Amino acid sequence: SAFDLDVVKLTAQFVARRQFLTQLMQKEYQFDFLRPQHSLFNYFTKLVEQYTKILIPPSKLKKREVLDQVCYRVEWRKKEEEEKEKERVAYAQIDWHDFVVVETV
């Protein structure tokens, strides 16, 4: 898959700085991932974004703090399933023929 990866990431590199690809398509079935139809397209939208991000702080990162951050990320069902199970059991296990009605609607 090295080929696909490389072309995705390259067209993503250039696309990150969007007119060169739209010209390439008309100039030159290799870049079929450009259309949102081709599944890989999605991952493409990722890579570009990522590169777009590298362009953000092109600024140094001077990050205790890392720890605090990982904690906050951490911070950012089973029992229920169990109770439900119990309910299913009991519902399945009671006499629905022990009737004693009062009225009607």
Partner 1 sequence: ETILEQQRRYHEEKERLMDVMAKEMLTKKSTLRDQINSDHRTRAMQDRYMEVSGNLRDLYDDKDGLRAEFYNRLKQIKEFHRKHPNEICVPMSLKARENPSEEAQNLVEFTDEEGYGRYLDLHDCINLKASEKLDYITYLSIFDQLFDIPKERKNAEYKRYLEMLLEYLQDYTDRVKPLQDQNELFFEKKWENGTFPGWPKETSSALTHAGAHLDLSAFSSWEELASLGLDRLKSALLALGLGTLEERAQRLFSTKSLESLDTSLFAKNPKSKGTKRDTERNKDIAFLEAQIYEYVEILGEQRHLTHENVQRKQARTGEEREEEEEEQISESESEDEENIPYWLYKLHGLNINYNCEICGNYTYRGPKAFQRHFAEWRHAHGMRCLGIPNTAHFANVTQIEDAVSLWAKLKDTEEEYEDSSGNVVNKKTYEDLKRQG
Partner 2 sequence: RPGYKVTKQRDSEMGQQSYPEIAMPRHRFMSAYEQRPDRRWQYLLMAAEPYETIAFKVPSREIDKAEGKFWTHWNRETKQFFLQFHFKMEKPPAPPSL
Residues that bind partner 1 (CB under 8 A): 1-3, 5-7, 9-11, 13-14, 16, 20, 24, 50-51, 53-54, 60-61, 63-64, 66-67, 69-71, 73-75
Q: Which is nearer to partner 1, 13 or 42 (CB)?
A: 13
Residue 11: how many CB atoms within 10 A of its CB? 21
Tokens of 47: 């890579």
The C-alpha atoms of residue 68 and residue 74 are separated, in whole angstroms, by 10
Site string for partner 2, 69-98 (x = CB under 8 A): -----------x---x-xxx-xx--xxxxx
Residues making up the chain, counted from first to last: 105
